[PDB]
Amino acid sequence: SMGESRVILAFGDSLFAGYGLDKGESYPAKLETALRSHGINARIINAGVSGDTTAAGLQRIKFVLDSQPDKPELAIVELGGNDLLRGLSPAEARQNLSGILEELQRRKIPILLMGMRAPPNLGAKYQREFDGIYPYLAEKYDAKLVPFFLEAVADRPDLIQKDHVHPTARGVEELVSATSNAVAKALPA
Numbered sequence: 787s788m789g790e791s792r793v794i795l796a797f798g799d800s801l802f803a804g805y806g807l808d809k810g811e812s813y814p815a816k817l818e819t820a821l822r823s824h825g826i827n828a829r830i831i832n833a834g835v836s837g838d839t840t841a842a843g844l845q846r847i848k849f850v851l852d853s854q855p856d857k858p859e860l861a862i863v864e865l866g867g868n869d870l871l872r873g874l875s876p877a878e879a880r881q882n883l884s885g886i887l888e889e890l891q892r893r894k895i896p897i898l899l900m901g902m903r904a905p906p907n908l909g910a911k912y913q914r915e916f917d918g919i920y921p922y923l924a925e926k927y928d929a930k931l932v933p934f935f936l937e938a939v940a941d942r943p944d945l946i947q948k949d950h951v952h953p954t955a956r957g958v959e960e961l962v963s964a965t966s967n968a969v970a971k972a973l974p975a
Contacts (some may be wrong), residue, residue: 791829793856794818797843797886798864798900801935802834806947818829831858839868847886851893861890864900864935870916873908877910882917888936898930 796802796814804812814832821828833850836840843865851858863886869879890897901920902915924931939945953961 787825787827787945791827792860793854793858794830795850795854795858795895796830796832796834796860796864797847797850797861798834799835799838799843799846799868800834801900802862802864803836804832804834805836806949811849814898817920829856830866839864839872839874840865840879840886842868842967844882844885847889851889851895857893860898861895862898863887863890863929864902865915866902867917868906870902870908873912876912876916876919879916880923882920883923887923887929891893891927897927899924899929899931900935901931901933903934903958947951 794856796817802812802814804815810816810831812834814830814834815899818830831854835846838846843863863883865886866879867882868878869882887897887899899920902916904916906913908916920933921927934940
């Protein structure tokens with residue numbers, strides 16, 4: 787094909803940074819290769835930062851854009867999962883994301899928003915509130931939306947890395963039942 791590559795900014799968290807993966811296995815890297823099958827030569831800027839909240843993304847979006855030698859032709863925004871992991875306000879996550887999208891819109895950079903979904907642990911009230919921020923933002927900022935970015939691995943534990951193992955309340959009870967003898971024995975009489 788003719789021409790310089792198309793520049794795409796992948797602005798996200800550990801799901802874009804490729805946490806736990808080897809060189810070339812992150813989503814941005816594999817997406818760049820896959821877009822050749824759509825007739826597109828892309829250079830995808832991996833602006834994934836592991837652990838970034840929406841507030842962290844807002845803090846760096848201007849710097850990341852000003853750092854680019856070539857202006858992005860599309861920005862993919864994938865943030866909010868770490869807000870959920872911290873149990874942080876969904877409203878504040880929406881506000882922070884709004885500031886990120888507003889900066890991209892000022893610069894006339896098209897936006898694709900990756901929708902995040904809350905697990906049931908924080909409860910239905912929180913989950914509904916969190917989940918709804920993404921359709922709200924896509925409409926308000928005229929962004930395209932992937933409603934559920936992680937949908938293709940939702941039902942596939944075999945496609946999810948084993949790393950953090952946080953017991954449920956019932957799991958804690960199991961740990962206590964297995965280890966209390968050792969604790970009692972270690973405590974001097």
